[PDB]
Amino acid sequence: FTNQYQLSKTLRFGATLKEDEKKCKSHEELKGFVDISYENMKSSATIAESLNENELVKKCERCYSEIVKFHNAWEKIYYRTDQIAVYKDFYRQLSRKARFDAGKQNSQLITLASLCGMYQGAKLSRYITNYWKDNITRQKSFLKDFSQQLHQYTRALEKSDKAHTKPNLINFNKTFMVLANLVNEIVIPLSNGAISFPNISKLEDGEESHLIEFALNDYSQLSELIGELKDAIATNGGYTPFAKVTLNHYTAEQKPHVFKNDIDAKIRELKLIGLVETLKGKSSEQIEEYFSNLDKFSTYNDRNQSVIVRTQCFKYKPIPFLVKHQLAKYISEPNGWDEDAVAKVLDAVGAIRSPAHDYANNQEGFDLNHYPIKVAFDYAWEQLANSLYTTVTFPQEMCEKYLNSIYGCEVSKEPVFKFYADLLYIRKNLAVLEHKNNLPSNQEEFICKINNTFENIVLPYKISQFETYKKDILAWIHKKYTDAKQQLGFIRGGLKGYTKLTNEFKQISSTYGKTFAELRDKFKEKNEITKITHFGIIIEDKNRDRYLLASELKHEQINHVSTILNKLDKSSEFITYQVKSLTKSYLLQSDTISKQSIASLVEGGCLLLPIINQDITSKERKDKNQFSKDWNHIFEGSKEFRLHPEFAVSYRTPIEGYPVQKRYGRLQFVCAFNAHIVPQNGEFINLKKQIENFNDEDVQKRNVTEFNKKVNHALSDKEYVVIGIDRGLKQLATLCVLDKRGKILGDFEIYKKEFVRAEKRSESHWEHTQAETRHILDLSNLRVETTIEGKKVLVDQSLTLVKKNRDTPDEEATEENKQKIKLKQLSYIRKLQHKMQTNEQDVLDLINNEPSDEEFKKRIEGLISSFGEGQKYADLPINTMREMISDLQGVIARGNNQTEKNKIIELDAADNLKQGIVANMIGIVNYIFAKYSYKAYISLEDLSRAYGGAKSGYDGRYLPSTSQDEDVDFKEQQNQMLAGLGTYQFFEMQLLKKLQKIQSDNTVLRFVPAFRSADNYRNILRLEETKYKSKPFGVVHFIDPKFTSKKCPVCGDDNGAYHIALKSVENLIQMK
RNA sequence: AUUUCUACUAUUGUAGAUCUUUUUUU
């Protein structure tokens, strides 16, 4: 089952030596130099923790309010596929982030309504709106979490004695950084103008004023406030990029000044310096007045103008993502201007203004000569078209004068214009009947108006089969309806034929596009040469202590690469490894450098960073992590385990008030080495080939079919077992191993730890003794643990007591394991939710008079049966239960939206136990799989039901916020499990990722076929069921939950594991 | 006590887990 694909890992190592007692001194051969380098790097690591917790809370509260406002506004607009339009560069970014093949788009501004093309059964616009919908749901989750944290934090600051409620500042930092990434992922595209609203000038205030206000917002303040907090967090516990080191000396000697002249040429093609010099120094309002004071037609028809000025005189078109910032820097620095005063000017080109909003705002300062030709033309044309059938607020004289100037004749008196007005009015009336969400009851009035409008249309020119469209539209009031309606739309939109202006904009836009694509390409190739900022080599002293000697790649001066490699000889005590590769193309070359050479290099200004790990630097240096094993296997020199030449070294600053012993009290650098597992046994599937396969659907279908054919042939004839993993009401998960005939197999021996103190304190150890024997594992509290004799055993962590205050060796263990009481409280929460579903009234009655916590517990004991442990109602989570019942109260107040209530009934309370319990479960499943010599099948639930049917919009990649199952009885039985959909889907995906890359002994095995990781659960929906309703995926067998139910095992919730394993046994036998 | 996560012990720590361009049009 050897892996034929190239795999990658990112091995991360520390780089700040922990000078402490109770930590073995390491890297002490060159320790002196290490110290110097550290105090060099602190000189660059800037920090000012001066922001008191009060001011941090002030900034956080303001940011939360702004983010909530923006999020509420955006929640109503992401799905407007008819108004949104993304630029080409951002469209490609979408097609990478969301996963769809971009196709070939003819236009620069790709309106989402024009992405009618299909891709694997869904429109291309549905992929984008689904990606935005998922982003919004995650924003909601993190806003809720961050609001709770901020509330507890400021409550703690209020009552100075109540410091116990201060949230863990680690989680505070991490939650805000995740929330800021989510928010910025949409605020940035709106801020710089990639997500645009091109129909903004035709729109009317009233029913669509919210969209206009959202199109005209200023996201400078919100973005700057998020930036303020991100800096504040990066100054007290936040990771902040330090360098990107390369280990190849041919990637470090490139000159980045090759492209310079070229870029300047393109800049002189845009006459940008003149524009920026003319505009810099003005405020945004002054720039607006300058642009609104230009002569529009004269500048547009003036061919000697820069294409930017002419475009802004025709249309609001922003400068792209990818050039703007680098262009501001590249314009400022040669000329000595302020960088920000130029970025402001480049932000001021393409700022949307709506003529209608301006006119409603003030009726005296209005004038149509302010706006570009297209915007003013659209406003005048559609307002004049609407004025023939409704009374509107704008005075027709200026619009008529504008159109008369454009065409040279009275536009409102042409038959073509009246025909356009009639078609538009018919479209407006048809829109009401085609919005089935809010159907009225006065259909007769609309139909009478529609008939009269069709009757009174006087066709200005001979148009063919128009009456066919008329009769179809009348007949419907269904596919023929849409066809005729769209053909009427084509005829209506073609009535403006003005064609001279658009013909000129053809050439203007072609030049504006070619020049900016040349700039973008030159910048992209320039910023992959200035990305690397150091050249480093790994160094081993005599005790296998590895340091990284990194020298600055000064672009302002000759670099030191030649002075590092002129000290590497063949006879010296320190070994040096440096990588040489080109993309059988890799070499890890070793030389030696003496101590005087390192001394001179470091005094010259280079950096020396220890590479620290718990196993690399322990007193016996036995490797027990996988990262340490891979570290010591990379430097064996082989080619099947490769080191990627460049890696990013970062750092995080200390948190105030933490002890220096803790890793959060120390300025901690981090190296991020990158390793490739590339086979040599034949033609390995290159990563590009993997990507191409992942894009193709049929390649995947053939691949999965052939892989499970390999498995079935290589395993069916041999003696194998079936490992069925199932959820549980009381047990988080449950594992049963059946024989291929169906008999229950396995007698697992569960152990128990105990720390025995030795007379010499340095040799204390945990002594494992057998405590239980079981044949159905309770995967909640187990963990696979290595005895000091070398054996691997399964221990039950709930059987051992822990200590109240840690680091009290003299005291005796009293408390209960924290994960155990977390699962206790999780079962209580599940009980509460199942009680809400059936007795929402008996749940809401719990808070009749704001009961005190003792009274709240007394009332809870009425509804929810106790856990059944030693102590009844021991660790009841009164706080979380109270803030879930109050949330249900708030939902049922504002109406009784069933979906909004299921957002609470199915909250998946196990989401903080996820990362910790799934690791244990993966460890145990790996242990049992490798116990039976990899000749075993895995048998898992198929969560596909929770993603609705084929009709539903959920393709699988994005988790539903609420389960979309059709049954109510089954959806109720799946809402009582400890592991929600998110938790159990996370476990399943982690297990598949684990099976894809099993490392048995210095080798990599594979049992699931080319599972594309970034696509969460489509890989399982897309599979083909056998005729027994089980989806085979390599070793794994995804079994539908509902169709696994039979006579109970002769031999409560372990029979579930037995029944999944038994159904897989039966299906596998019936296969052959 | 940690590259980091989780549960710990006080064992100079332990156990599992860990990545080219292309406008106006529905």
Q: Per residue, what are the HEC states of A337-353?
A: CCHHHHHHHHHCCCCCC
Count CB-CB contacts under 10 A for residue A907. 21
Both A568 and A481 in a single domain?
no
Residue A479 lies in a domain: yes
Residue pair A1059/A1044 in contact (Cβ under 8 Å)? The answer is: yes
Please answer whether residues A729 and A1054 qualify as being in contact, where contact means their C-beta atoms are separated by less than 8 angstroms: no
A919: nearest Cα among A749, A777, A783, A727? A783
d(CA A578, CA A593): 12
Q: Å between A2 CA and B23 C1'? A: 55
The tally of CA atoms less than 13 A away on the side-chain side of residue A344 is 17
- Domain count of the fold of chain A: 4
> How far, in Å, is the CA of A502 from the C1' of nucleotide B23?
6
- Domain around A480: 415-497
Asked if A638 and A716 sit in the same domain, the reply is no
- If one counts every other C-beta atom within 10 angstroms of the C-beta of residue A831, the result is 19
Axis-axis angle for helices A466-476, A443-456 (nearest 10): 170
Residues constituting chain A: 1072
Q: How far is the CA of A796 from the C1' of B9 (A)?
A: 16
- A462/A555 same-domain check: no
A997 falls within a domain: yes
CB A568, CB A549: distance < 8 Å: no
Q: Please, are residues A97 and A80 in contact by the beta-carbon 8 Å criterion?
A: no
From residue A309, alpha-carbon distances to A216, A275, A327, A372, A431 in Å are 21, 8, 17, 11, 38
Residue A519 CA and nucleotide B21 C1' are separated, in Å, by: 13
- Structure tokens belonging to residue A77: 């607009």
Domain stops at, among A654, A677, A700:
A677
State phi, psi for A63 to the nearest 5 degrees: -65, -40
Q: Answer yes or no: is A806 within a domain.
A: yes
Measure the CA–CA gap between A272 and A512, rounded to whole angstroms.
Answer: 12
Return the closest nucleotide (C1') to the Cα of A922.
Answer: B17
**Alpha carbons A959 and A270: distance in angstroms, whole number:** 46
Residues 6+ apart with CB under 8 A from A1013: A989, A993
d(CA A344, CA A346): 5
Nearest nucleotide to A11 (CA to C1') is: B3
Distance A321 CA to B12 C1' (A): 53
**CA end-to-end distance (rounded Å), chain A:** 21
**In which element (H, E) is residue A722 found?**
strand A721-726
- What gap in Å lies between CA A87 and CA A194, rounded to an integer? 5
Dihedral angle, C-alpha A661, A662, A668, A674, nearest 10 ° = 120
Which residues neighbour A936 within 8 Å (Cβ) at sequence distance 6 or greater?
A720, A721, A722, A723, A737, A928, A929, A1035
User: How is chain A split among helix, strand and coil, in percent rounded to 5?
Assistant: 50, 15, 40
Residue A1051 known to bind ligand: yes
Q: Which nucleotide is nearest to A107 (CA to C1')?
A: B22
Nearest nucleotide over every DNA/RNA strand to the A629 CA, judged by C1': B18
CA of A435 to C1' of B3 (A): 56
Going from the C-alpha of A248 to that of each of A567, A578, A588, A592, A607, the distances in angstroms are: 16, 7, 10, 17, 17
Q: Could you give the CA distance from residue A141 to residue A903 in angstroms, rounded to a whole number? A: 11
Read off the amino acid at residue A866: S
A746 CB neighbour count, 10 Å cutoff: 18
Q: Please spell the DSSP secondary structure of A811-832, one letter per residue.
A: S---B--HHHHHHHHHHHHHHH
Contact criterion met (CB below 8 Å) for A169 and A237: yes
Are A711 and A670 in the same domain?
no
Q: Please indicate, yes or no, whether residues A420 and A470 belong to a single structural domain of this protein.
A: yes
Looking from the CA of A711 toward its CB, the CA atoms found within 13 Å total 25
Beta strands in A764-866 (DSSP E): 765-766, 769-774, 777-778, 782-786, 792-796
Residue A642: phi and psi, rounded to 5, are: -105, 155
Shared-domain flag, residues A58 and A14: no
Are residue A121 and residue A81 in the same domain, yes or no? Answer: yes
Question: Nearest residue to nucleotide B3 when comparing alpha carbons to its C1'?
Answer: A13
Which nucleotides on chain B have any atom < 7 A from a protein Cβ? 1-26
Q: Which residue gives the smallest C-alpha to C1' distance to B8?
A: A802
Indicate the residue among A210, A227, A244 that finishes a domain: A227
Could you tell me if residue A372 is inside a domain?
no
Under a CB-based contact definition with an 8 Å cutoff, are residues A1041 and A1065 in contact?
no
- Protein residue with the closest CA to the C1' atom of nucleotide B25: A493
Long-range (24+ apart) CB contacts under 8 A made by A126-130 are A126/A953, A127/A98, A127/A99, A127/A100, A128/A86, A128/A94, A128/A98, A129/A78, A129/A79, A129/A81, A130/A98, A130/A953, A130/A955, A130/A958
- The verdict on residue A282 lying in a domain is no
- Nearest Cα to Cα of residue A422 among A458, A447, A391: A458
Cα A377 from Cα A202, distance rounded (Å): 10
* SS3 at position A490: helix
- Tell me which protein residue sits closest to nucleotide B11, measuring alpha carbon to C1': A764
Cα-based angle A972, A977, A982 (whole degrees, multiple of 5): 100
What are the residues facing A786 on neighbouring strands? A792
Which structure tokens are listed for A249? 């000396």
- With CA of A766 and C1' of each nucleotide, the nearest comes out as B14
- In angstroms, the Cα distances linking A10 to A574, A647, A672 are 26, 9, 6
- Residue A739 annotated as binding? no
Going by their DSSP bridges, the two strands A1030-1033 and A1036-1039 should be labelled as antiparallel
What whole-number distance in Å separates Cα of residue A15 and Cα of residue A479? Answer: 66
**Is residue A1021 within 8 Å of A956, Cβ to Cβ?**
yes
* d(CA A905, C1' B19) / Å: 34
Checking each nucleotide's C1' against the CA of A104, the nearest proves to be B22
Please report, as a single letter, which amino acid is at residue A736.
Answer: C
Nucleotide nearest to A659 (CA to C1'): B1
Residues A697 and A665 in one domain: no
Q: Provide the Cα torsion A947, A950, A956, A961; round to 10°.
A: -40
d(CA A42, C1' B6) / Å: 31
Tokens at A572, concatenated: 């010296």
- Say which residue the tokens 């016996």 belong to: A620
> What whole-number distance in Å separates Cα of residue A233 and Cα of residue A967?
46
Tokens 């990066």 belong to: A234
For residue A55, what are its two tokens?
């001011």
Query: Could you give the CA distance from residue A173 to residue A156 in angstroms, rounded to a whole number?
Result: 17
Q: What is the DSSP letter of A660?
A: S
**Which of A617, A608, A621, A615 shows the shortest CA–CA distance to A649?**
A608
Write the CB contacts of A599 (distance below 8 Å, at least 6 apart in sequence): A33
φ and ψ of A332, to 5 deg: -65, -50
Going by C-alpha positions, the residue among A345, A352, A350 that lies closest to residue A273 is A345
Largest Cα span, chain A: 107
**Would residue A157 count as lying in a domain?**
yes
The angle subtended at Cα A951 by Cα A948 and Cα A952, nearest 5°, is 45
Task: Name the token pair of A377.
Answer: 């033309």
Q: Across-strand partners of A1031? A: A1038
Q: Method of determination?
A: cryo-EM
Which nucleotide is at minimal CA–C1' distance from A506?
A: B23
* Structural tokens at position A745: 């197999």
Q: Are residue A446 and residue A570 in the same domain, yes or no?
A: no
| Overall resolution, Å | 3.2
A750 CB neighbour count, 10 Å cutoff: 18
Nearest one of A498, A500, A496, A501 to A460, comparing CA atoms: A496
**Which of A204, A227, A250 is the last residue in one of the domains?**
A227
Answer whether residue A379 is part of any domain.
no
d(CA A315, CA A307): 12
Quote the tokens at residue A829: 């929460």
Q: Which two tokens stand for residue A190?
A: 């709106």
Measure Cα distances from A1016 to A409, A690, A918, A938 in Å.
Answer: 61, 17, 16, 19
Rounded to the nearest 5°, which phi and psi values hold at A661?
Answer: -60, -45
Q: For residue A216, give every residue at least 6 positions away whose Cβ sits within 8 Å of its Cβ, in sequence order, or none.
A: A352, A353, A354, A357
Are A672 and A711 within one domain?
A: no
Residue A736 known to bind ligand: no
Where chain A is discontinuous (C–N > 2.5 Å), the residues before each break are: 477, 497, 583, 1051
* Residue A1031, both tokens: 């989806």
Q: Whole-number Å distance, CA A919 to C1' B5?
A: 9
Cross-strand partners of A774: A748
C-alpha–C-alpha distance, residues A2 and A448, integer Å? 73
Q: How do A646-652 and A243-246 pair as beta strands? A: antiparallel
CA of A659 to C1' of B9 (A): 19
Question: Which residues have C-beta within 8 Å of that of residue A80, sequence separation ≥ 6?
Answer: A211
Alpha helix segments (H runs only) across A271-320: 272-279, 284-292, 296-300, 307-314
Residue whose Cα is closest to the C1' of B10: A807
* Residue A216 falls inside a structural domain: yes
Nucleotide nearest to A489 (CA to C1'): B26
* Helix orientation angle between A307-314 and A373-387, rounded to the nearest 10 degrees: 10
A116 CA, B22 C1': Å apart: 19
Residues A933 and A1034 in one domain: yes
Helix and strand numbers, DSSP H then E, in chain A:
36, 32
Q: Per residue in A464-475, is it b (16+ CB within 10 Å) or e — as a string? A: eebeebbebbee
Q: Same structural domain for residues A83 and A210?
A: yes
